[PDB]
Amino acid sequence: DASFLSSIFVPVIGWVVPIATFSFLFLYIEREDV
Amino acid sequence: AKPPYTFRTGWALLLLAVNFLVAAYYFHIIQ
Amino acid sequence: LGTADFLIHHIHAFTIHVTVLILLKGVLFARSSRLIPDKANLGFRFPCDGPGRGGTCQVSGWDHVFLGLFWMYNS
Amino acid sequence: ATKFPKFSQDLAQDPTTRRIWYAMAMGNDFESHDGMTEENLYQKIFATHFGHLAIIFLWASSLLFHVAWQGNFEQWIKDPLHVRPIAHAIWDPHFGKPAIEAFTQAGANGPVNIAYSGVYHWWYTIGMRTNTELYTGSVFLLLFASLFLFAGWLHLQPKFRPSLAWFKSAESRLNHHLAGLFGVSSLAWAGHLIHVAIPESRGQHVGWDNFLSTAPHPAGLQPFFTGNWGVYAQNPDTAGHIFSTSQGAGTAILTFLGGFHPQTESLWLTDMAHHHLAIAVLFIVAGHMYRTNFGIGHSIKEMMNAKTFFGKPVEGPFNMPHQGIYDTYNNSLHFQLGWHLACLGVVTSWVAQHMYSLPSYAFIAKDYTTQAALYTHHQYIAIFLMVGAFAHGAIFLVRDYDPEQNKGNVLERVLQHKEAIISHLSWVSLFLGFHTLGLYVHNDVVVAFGTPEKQILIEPVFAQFIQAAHGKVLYGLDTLLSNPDSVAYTAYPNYANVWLPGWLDAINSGTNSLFLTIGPGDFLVHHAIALGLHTTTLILVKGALDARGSKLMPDKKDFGYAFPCDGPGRGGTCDISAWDSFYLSLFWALNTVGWVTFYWHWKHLGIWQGNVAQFNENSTYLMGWFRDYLWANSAQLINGYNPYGVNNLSVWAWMFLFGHLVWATGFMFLISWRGYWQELIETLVWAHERTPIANLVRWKDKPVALSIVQARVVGLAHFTVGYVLTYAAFLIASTAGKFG
Amino acid sequence: LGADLTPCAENPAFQALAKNARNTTADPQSGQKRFERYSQALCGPEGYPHLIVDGRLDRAGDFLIPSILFLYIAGWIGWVGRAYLQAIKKDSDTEQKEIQLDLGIALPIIATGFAWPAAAVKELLSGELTAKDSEITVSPR
Amino acid sequence: SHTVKIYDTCIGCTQCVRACPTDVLEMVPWDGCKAAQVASSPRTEDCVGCKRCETACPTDFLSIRVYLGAETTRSMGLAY
Amino acid sequence: VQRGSKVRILRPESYWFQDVGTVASVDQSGIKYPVIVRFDKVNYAGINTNNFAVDELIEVE
Amino acid sequence: FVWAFSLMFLFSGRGYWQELIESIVWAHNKLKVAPAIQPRALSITQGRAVGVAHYLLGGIATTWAFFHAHILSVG
Amino acid sequence: SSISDTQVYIALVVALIPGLLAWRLATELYK
Amino acid sequence: LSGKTPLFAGSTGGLLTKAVEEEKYAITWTSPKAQVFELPTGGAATMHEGENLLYIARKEYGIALGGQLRKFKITNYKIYRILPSGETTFIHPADGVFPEKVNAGREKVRFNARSIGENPNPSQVKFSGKATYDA
Ligand code: CLA
Ligand code: CLA
Ligand code: CLA
Ligand code: CLA
Numbered sequence A: 001d002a003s004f005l006s007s008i009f010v011p012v013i014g015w016v017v018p019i020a021t022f023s024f025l026f027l028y029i030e031r032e033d034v
Numbered sequence B: 001a002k003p004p005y006t007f008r009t010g011w012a013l014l015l016l017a018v019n020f021l022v023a024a025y026y027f028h029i030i031q
Numbered sequence C: 001l002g003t004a005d006f007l008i009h010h011i012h013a014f015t016i017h018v019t020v021l022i023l024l025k026g027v028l029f030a031r032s033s034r035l036i037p038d039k040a041n042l043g044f045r046f047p048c049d050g051p052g053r054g055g056t057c058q059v060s061g062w063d064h065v066f067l068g069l070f071w072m073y074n075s
Numbered sequence D: 001a002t003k004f005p006k007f008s009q010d011l012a013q014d015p016t017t018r019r020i021w022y023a024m025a026m027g028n029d030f031e032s033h034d035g036m037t038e039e040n041l042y043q044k045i046f047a048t049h050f051g052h053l054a055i056i057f058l059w060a061s062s063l064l065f066h067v068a069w070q071g072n073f074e075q076w077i078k079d080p081l082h083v084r085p086i087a088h089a090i091w092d093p094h095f096g097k098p099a100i101e102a103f104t105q106a107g108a109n110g111p112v113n114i115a116y117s118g119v120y121h122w123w124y125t126i127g128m129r130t131n132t133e134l135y136t137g138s139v140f141l142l143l144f145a146s147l148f149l150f151a152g153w154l155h156l157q158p159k160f161r162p163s164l165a166w167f168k169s170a171e172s173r174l175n176h177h178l179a180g181l182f183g184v185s186s187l188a189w190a191g192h193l194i195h196v197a198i199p200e201s202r203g204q205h206v207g208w209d210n211f212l213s214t215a216p217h218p219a220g221l222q223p224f225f226t227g228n229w230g231v232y233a234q235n236p237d238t239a240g241h242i243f244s245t246s247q248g249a250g251t252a253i254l255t256f257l258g259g260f261h262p263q264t265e266s267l268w269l270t271d272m273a274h275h276h277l278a279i280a281v282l283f284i285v286a287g288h289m290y291r292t293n294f295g296i297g298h299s300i301k302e303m304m305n306a307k308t309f310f311g312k313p314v315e316g317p318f319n320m321p322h323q324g325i326y327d328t329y330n331n332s333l334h335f336q337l338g339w340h341l342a343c344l345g346v347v348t349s350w351v352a353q354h355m356y357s358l359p360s361y362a363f364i365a366k367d368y369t370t371q372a373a374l375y376t377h378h379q380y381i382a383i384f385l386m387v388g389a390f391a392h393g394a395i396f397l398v399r400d401y402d403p404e405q406n407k408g409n410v411l412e413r414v415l416q417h418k419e420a421i422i423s424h425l426s427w428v429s430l431f432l433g434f435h436t437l438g439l440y441v442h443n444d445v446v447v448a449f450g451t452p453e454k455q456i457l458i459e460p461v462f463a464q465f466i467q468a469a470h471g472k473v474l475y476g477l478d479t480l481l482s483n484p485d486s487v488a489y490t491a492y493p494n495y496a497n498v499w500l501p502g503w504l505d506a507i508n509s510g511t512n513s514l515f516l517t518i519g520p521g522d523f524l525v526h527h528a529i530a531l532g533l534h535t536t537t538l539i540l541v542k543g544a545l546d547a548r549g550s551k552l553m554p555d556k557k558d559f560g561y562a563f564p565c566d567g568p569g570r571g572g573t574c575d576i577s578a579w580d581s582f583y584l585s586l587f588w589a590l591n592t593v594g595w596v597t598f599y600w601h602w603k604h605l606g607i608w609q610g611n612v613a614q615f616n617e618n619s620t621y622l623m624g625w626f627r628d629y630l631w632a633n634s635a636q637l638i639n640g641y642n643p644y645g646v647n648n649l650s651v652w653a654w655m656f657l658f659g660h661l662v663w664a665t666g667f668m669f670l671i672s673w674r675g676y677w678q679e680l681i682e683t684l685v686w687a688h689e690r691t692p693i694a695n696l697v698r699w700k701d702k703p704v705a706l707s708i709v710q711a712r713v714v715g716l717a718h719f720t721v722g723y724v725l726t727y728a729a730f731l732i733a734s735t736a737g738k739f740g
Numbered sequence E: 001l002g003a004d005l006t007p008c009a010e011n012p013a014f015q016a017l018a019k020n021a022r023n024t025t026a027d028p029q030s031g032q033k034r035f036e037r038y039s040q041a042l043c044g045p046e047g048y049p050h051l052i053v054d055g056r057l058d059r060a061g062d063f064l065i066p067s068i069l070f071l072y073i074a075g076w077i078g079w080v081g082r083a084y085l086q087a088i089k090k091d092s093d094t095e096q097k098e099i100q101l102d103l104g105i106a107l108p109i110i111a112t113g114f115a116w117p118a119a120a121v122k123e124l125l126s127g128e129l130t131a132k133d134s135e136i137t138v139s140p141r
Numbered sequence F: 001s002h003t004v005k006i007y008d009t010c011i012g013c014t015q016c017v018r019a020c021p022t023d024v025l026e027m028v029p030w031d032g033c034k035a036a037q038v039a040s041s042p043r044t045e046d047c048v049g050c051k052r053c054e055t056a057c058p059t060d061f062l063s064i065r066v067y068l069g070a071e072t073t074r075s076m077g078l079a080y
Numbered sequence G: 001v002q003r004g005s006k007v008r009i010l011r012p013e014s015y016w017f018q019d020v021g022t023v024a025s026v027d028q029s030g031i032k033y034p035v036i037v038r039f040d041k042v043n044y045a046g047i048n049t050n051n052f053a054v055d056e057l058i059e060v061e
Numbered sequence H: 001f002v003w004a005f006s007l008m009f010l011f012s013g014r015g016y017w018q019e020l021i022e023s024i025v026w027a028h029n030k031l032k033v034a035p036a037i038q039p040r041a042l043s044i045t046q047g048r049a050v051g052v053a054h055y056l057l058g059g060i061a062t063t064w065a066f067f068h069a070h071i072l073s074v075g
Numbered sequence I: 001s002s003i004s005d006t007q008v009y010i011a012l013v014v015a016l017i018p019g020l021l022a023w024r025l026a027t028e029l030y031k
Numbered sequence J: 001l002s003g004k005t006p007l008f009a010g011s012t013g014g015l016l017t018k019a020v021e022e023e024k025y026a027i028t029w030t031s032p033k034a035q036v037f038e039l040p041t042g043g044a045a046t047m048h049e050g051e052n053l054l055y056i057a058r059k060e061y062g063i064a065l066g067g068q069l070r071k072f073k074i075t076n077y078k079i080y081r082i083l084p085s086g087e088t089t090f091i092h093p094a095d096g097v098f099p100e101k102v103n104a105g106r107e108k109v110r111f112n113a114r115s116i117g118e119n120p121n122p123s124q125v126k127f128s129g130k131a132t133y134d135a
């Protein structure tokens, strides 16, 4: 009955992890601090 | 150096003799 | 003529326009670009102008004919 | 510097997109970072190994957790020859209802993927029987990866960073790796086999809750310490033993039978236990050879530099000068990395060659698609490791090699005549290629003109001799083990070749893949394989030995390993760097492995159907390969989806087309070169800066075309991803549409 | 020998192929004479003659005779080319004589080239076959 | 920038200075050759890296070398 | 080193390293590479002459 | 075959080929068979020209043989 | 058929441990 | 700077946003007569009789333009670097003499007092700031 975990993890791994990862890395590679 | 080349032709002759031994087992000369 | 014919005629439009892009780019930029100003001193047919300016391989008009032969083939 | 990447002040001052791309490509080259010392180099490498090792153990935990939770392992134990193993479940919101119906398979409840890696056969062989055991294995591997992650964190803290002398203390690491990491691990694996896997195969449960009580053999350690070791070999499993049941079951734990278990068609477990015990004793003894803190043992440095042979002066070991090779190995991380990649690539090919012909896991010899997937997987991994072996030989020669500390030794002698080596690899390459191609074209024309009896067909008489010396009676050669009157056959003095009846029973079955019958189709393909090996070696060896300099660029070591060219002058110098031989040789390595896996697959696909005659009659000319292997076997693949519907091969059809697309996208980066794209991007910059509302935004980093080396990288990456995915889609789908 | 090599004259698949033989030339019995000549080879179960190249004298015509024949003709060609390049390196413009052949130099050389093994052995023993490793160019190590 | 080096096998034939499209090179006085002049590269910040100087150099195995390095706006040849 | 002599190049970076060329002229002004050698082989730049030092030469007569 | 053989010329450059010719010219200098017309790898432009000529020749001859053998059989 | 839900949740909570340890190793390797 | 901008109807090839933000260049020359030349950005323009002033995106544009002003026998062309601070520096020729000619007062820069096969090995200079070409 733990098959509901896929409807959380696959949209997380497909949208939330890419958006957060790319947003951090975009702001990081364009920053002039570090 | 060594114009007879005795160390490197000893091992070349040994490898070729092992080759001839395998071929002697191939052509049914031995056994 | 139907949807498959619509699709393939736009494939044709695409592949001709890309071939025209390559060949027209080679004709309009045969003498100069922003990158290499004295390109017409180097000739029509020359390989490059060295690895500098980032790398300037296949800038000649000949090289555009080269690259456009493949897209002509594709089309 | 003051901006990403922080390891390169030269890249961080680049105002273009090239900053980002070369940051991504140089992040793992620790040596080229700003202010790298040698000690900090080895400390960082040592902690990243713990990280990578944790990545491996988290991967294995994924396999176990997903089979334990989503697979059908407990349903697969009951009938391994018929139930399809489930890899994992599919949650895709993109599927329509007929795709969900097509992928609801293997008796599962929703859409699932069929497993092709063979881990059910492996886990079943080693004693696992329930989903709970797979689950505790995966949780264990999570904690084990946690232990390596903490250890890698810990050895970066300032009191725990190991000194540079600790990293170069080679003889201690050899004693520990040979004795510990090989021998204790092998001895413990013999212990698992004997305590767990042999009783589970004989029907008796042994777990963590009863292994301190149940003895593996009824006699105990009493025969071991008394030296009556043959007690452990008495009463083996019979020829009517059924796996994981009690009928036909013996009590032996250490046999030397040979051949295969007749039900599961794989090697005997007591033979493997005895293998790992004897292997462990060998490696533990070998781990006492070298000198450490305790006075006894060998000094490898002294063994290199030695100049006397019982008072007679020699150049060195085998009269060959090895002075400075100890330092050349021990001081250069690229020498060690290229050397280990070579050894590991040989071992990966050797693993690949044995797991189809001498399989170990129960019933995997009848799971044909996993046999194809495993052999093709390890042969691709092997060719990549060999390309990297030579690539780090070339990086070693550029960066780490000084001729003054290798003065007069064997490596300098190799460098002194590199033209002879390269021209002889060229001779062997042309010699194989001309004749193997012309032979195929002879046979192909002659079959085309309707007279196929004029084919040049050559028996592989020497490899058929080797099969005959191994005891295969089919050729009728009456040599070493096929001759029952031979001294090899009877083993005359001792007569202790106790493996020989089981080995001869397996090799003369004709129902397995143990030394398959070969003929003239096997001959020509082995010479094509020799061609591919020799040409890939030619490119790699030539790039290594010319990495320092050549006549066209005498100062190539001043530019390093990877640089675009030396410009248009001196005739033109495209692909002159040592990196460019890596580039050019990945094509020949992929080609070579494509020839070997096409050959493996088409021969076995003949055997698996009962039609060896198709291969034996049609592989002597190239249209037989084309028609009967590429055309004939791709039929069911490209019908994975069609205008009428969809079946379970539609992922592999979609992947097949995908791989064609990635492979062909490569050719753009390989054929069109940089200055075209740079002139095109300049007009895109004009168009963006002259367009209204799009004027409101623009770039912080200036758009440029990819660099010359970058484009070679991207094109080769596309080429090989498309190569791998196209072949893996075809291999899986063509085998599994025929056999499941 | 290996993998079901019967003689061609006894193989039923060879006898079945010989009945449907195609004519190679304009001779109406090229196929029959082809199978009569091939009847003494060894034969797979598909009917096709397999060749044995291990060097036994029962099968010398499979590979040993063509080996001697090729190596003689190839040594002829290579020795004549070496003799021509060595003969023209003294005649005051060598590169022009490589695209425009001196027939008065080349044709006596191609007539002389029948005895290339004796000439090659006399070239070998006198130290004239090879140049020294210090005499010819190399690249920095 | 890139780095343009000059070695003492220079014969001062001025051809690299004529080949340069960005005025990196110049001829300075010397006593090491018959022409009594070397090449020198004071403006290497303007080096695009195109290696016309090395193509122009006549001495066998060049008296001038360009070592490509950190890329700037000038060395990438960008007009934007 | 005399004009007309057949020298052999000892310069390892040279195209004609361990090859035989002919001396064209030798300067006496004390420059670093005084000897001009002409070759029958052109290099990759199409040039068959180069300045050499005396230490980079051995005479072949 | 001719199509695939084009890709050796398209994907490579001439520094590799000139450096391989150096070792082969060594083996000819060793046996006194080096030609006075010195062997050079093809120029960058010629390598591109040969590559596109074989790519076009191979691809068009493939479609030629395909079209001929299908339409002489079904039509 | 499969494993229970509680075992899945225990495996996820245990996988929080090498995730935190991998974050700490990756940030320490960065400096 | 002084000079008349040459007569042409404009192009898309001219100065972009780099001119107002980091760097701009200019070439001046004096011509004996009005005559047609070719712009580095593409196109035909007419130079004026007398002094001229044409702005360019890169230094290489002015060196290509001054290379084709040699063909009209105009050899007094000067190139200026122009920063957005208004700071104009005179770059070519920098000495006043064209660099093909030797002028005194010029010092050697980046000369190596050795031949090029006498550079150190990269392993001999490893883990330090120096390269093999550096002195
Ligand atoms: C007995 C003591 C001992 C042990 C067990 C180890 C173990 C290890 N050391 Mg270590 N080391 C030791 C002492 C020891 N060391 C000492 C004393 C020193 C100092 C002189 C070092 C210095 C040292 C350094 C500097 C490094 C290591 C590294 C490693 C790791 C090697 C990589 C690996 O996992 O290979 C695993 C190897 C095996 C399992 C055996 C070989 C595998 C073969 C080739 C495969 C074939 C077997 C079989 C057929 C396959 C079955 C497959 C099937 C199950 C699927 C490993 C964890 C490296 C590392 O990763 O550190 C984090 C590293 O860089 N060691
Ligand atoms: C034990 C294994 C091992 C180790 C430790 C190293 C270590 C190293 N190698 Mg190396 N190498 C290896 C194996 C290894 N290699 C193998 C097997 C090969 C043959 C392929 C090579 C070939 C090689 C070359 C040619 C070079 C290195 C370089 C390097 C150094 C830097 C790597 C770097 O920063 O690249 C950064 C890494 C990346 C940017 C990752 C590239 C990503 C690739 C293309 C995979 C992409 C696949 C893609 C995601 C698939 C998606 C498909 C999907 C759509 C389905 C580093 C010292 C380089 C160096 O600096 O040496 C001086 C260098 O020039 N190696
Ligand atoms: C089908 C494609 C193909 C073919 C045939 C070859 C053939 C060859 N490559 Mg390869 N190559 C290819 C693709 C191919 N390559 C690709 C895609 C790459 C990646 C860029 C490379 C990269 C590469 C490198 C980097 C190297 C080679 C090498 C070689 C040679 C290996 C020696 C050999 O087998 O001799 C056999 C010769 C042949 C098979 C070709 C001759 C064909 C017939 C016999 C000639 C008859 C022609 C006929 C008379 C018609 C006349 C034409 C007229 C009518 C117009 C050979 C010339 C190596 C080399 O030079 O070795 C010395 C080497 O270093 N190649
Ligand atoms: C299969 C191989 C292949 C492909 C895909 C391309 C693709 C392209 N080439 Mg090309 N090229 C190739 C081979 C190929 N080439 C070869 C072999 C050569 C050698 C001669 C060249 C030489 C060449 C030149 C000289 C030129 C091009 C141009 C172009 C572009 C055409 C215009 C355009 O944008 O179309 C649109 C793009 C496509 C149709 C590509 C497919 C896009 C997919 C269908 C959509 C994306 C899917 C999805 C949303 C992605 C999500 C991913 C996920 C991670 C979320 C395009 C990027 C021209 C160009 O740049 O003009 C603008 C141009 O001038 N190419």
Ligand code: CLA
Residues within 6 Å of the ligand: D423, D424, D426, D427, D430, E077, E078, E079, E080, E081, E082, E084, E085, E101, E106, E107, E109, E110, H023, H024, H025, H027, H028, H031, H033
């Ligand atoms: C005078 C003719 C001649 C001779 C004696 C040799 C001799 C040799 N060549 Mg060769 N070669 C030649 C011409 C010749 N070459 C030409 C014209 C080419 C350009 C195609 C090459 C290209 C070549 C390569 C690429 C390689 C050799 C290699 C070799 C060596 C091994 C044998 C071999 O691989 O042959 C193979 C040679 C060929 C396939 C070339 C074809 C030969 C032509 C068709 C015959 C030439 C005859 C001549 C034109 C007639 C003039 C006669 C006069 C009366 C006018 C050997 C020293 C190999 C080596 O270094 O190994 C150590 C090697 O890798 N050769």
Ligand SMILES: CC1=C(/C=C/C(C)=C/C=C/C(C)=C/C=C/C=C(C)/C=C/C=C(C)/C=C/C2=C(C)CCCC2(C)C)C(C)(C)CCC1
Residues within 6 Å of the ligand: D335, D338, D339, D342, D346, D389, D390, D392, D393, D394, D396, D397, D541, D544
């Ligand atoms: C059959 C048999 C046998 C035998 C075996 C053998 C003897 C084997 C061997 C094998 C071998 C013998 C192998 C080989 C391999 C090797 C390789 C593969 C190598 C390579 C390497 C590399 C890659 C290198 C690199 C480099 C360079 C290039 C430079 C410098 C650095 C280096 C060194 C790193 C016996 C008796 C047991 C028994 C019976 C069976």
Ligand SMILES: CC1=C(/C=C/C(C)=C/C=C/C(C)=C\C=C\C=C(C)\C=C\C=C(C)\C=C\C2=C(C)CCCC2(C)C)C(C)(C)CCC1
Residues within 6 Å of the ligand: E053, E054, E055, E063, E074, E075, E077, E078, E079, E082, E120, H031
């Ligand atoms: C018997 C037999 C066999 C075997 C074989 C063998 C194994 C051999 C080997 C051999 C060898 C291993 C050889 C080697 C050699 C080497 C060398 C060293 C060479 C050299 C050469 C030369 C030098 C040449 C010269 C010339 C001439 C003479 C003429 C022309 C020109 C030239 C120059 C080319 C077989 C099975 C196949 C078949 C059957 C029989």
Ligand SMILES: CC1=C(C/C=C(\C)CCC[C@H](C)CCC[C@H](C)CCCC(C)C)C(=O)c2ccccc2C1=O
Residues within 6 Å of the ligand: H008, H009, H010, H012, H013, H014, H017, H018, H040, H041, H042, H043, H044, H046, H047, H048
């Ligand atoms: C393979 C390859 C070569 C090697 C090819 C060469 C050197 C030319 C091919 C050899 C010619 C065909 C040999 C001709 C020799 C004689 C004319 C043969 C005479 C024989 C008689 C019987 C006629 C390049 O030079 C090259 C250059 C630039 C980019 C890519 C490549 C490239 O891919």
Ligand code: SF4
Residues within 6 Å of the ligand: C047, C048, C049, C050, C051, C052, C055, C056, C057, C058, D564, D565, D566, D567, D568, D572, D573, D574, D575, D673, D708, H013, H044
């Ligand atoms: S790689 Fe490009 S820039 Fe370099 S020599 Fe070749 S064509 Fe020219």
Ligand code: SF4
Residues within 6 Å of the ligand: C052, F004, F019, F020, F021, F022, F023, F024, F025, F046, F047, F048, F049, F050, F051, F052, F053, F054, F066
């Ligand atoms: S690389 Fe180009 S810009 Fe630099 S000095 Fe040479 S010719 Fe001038």
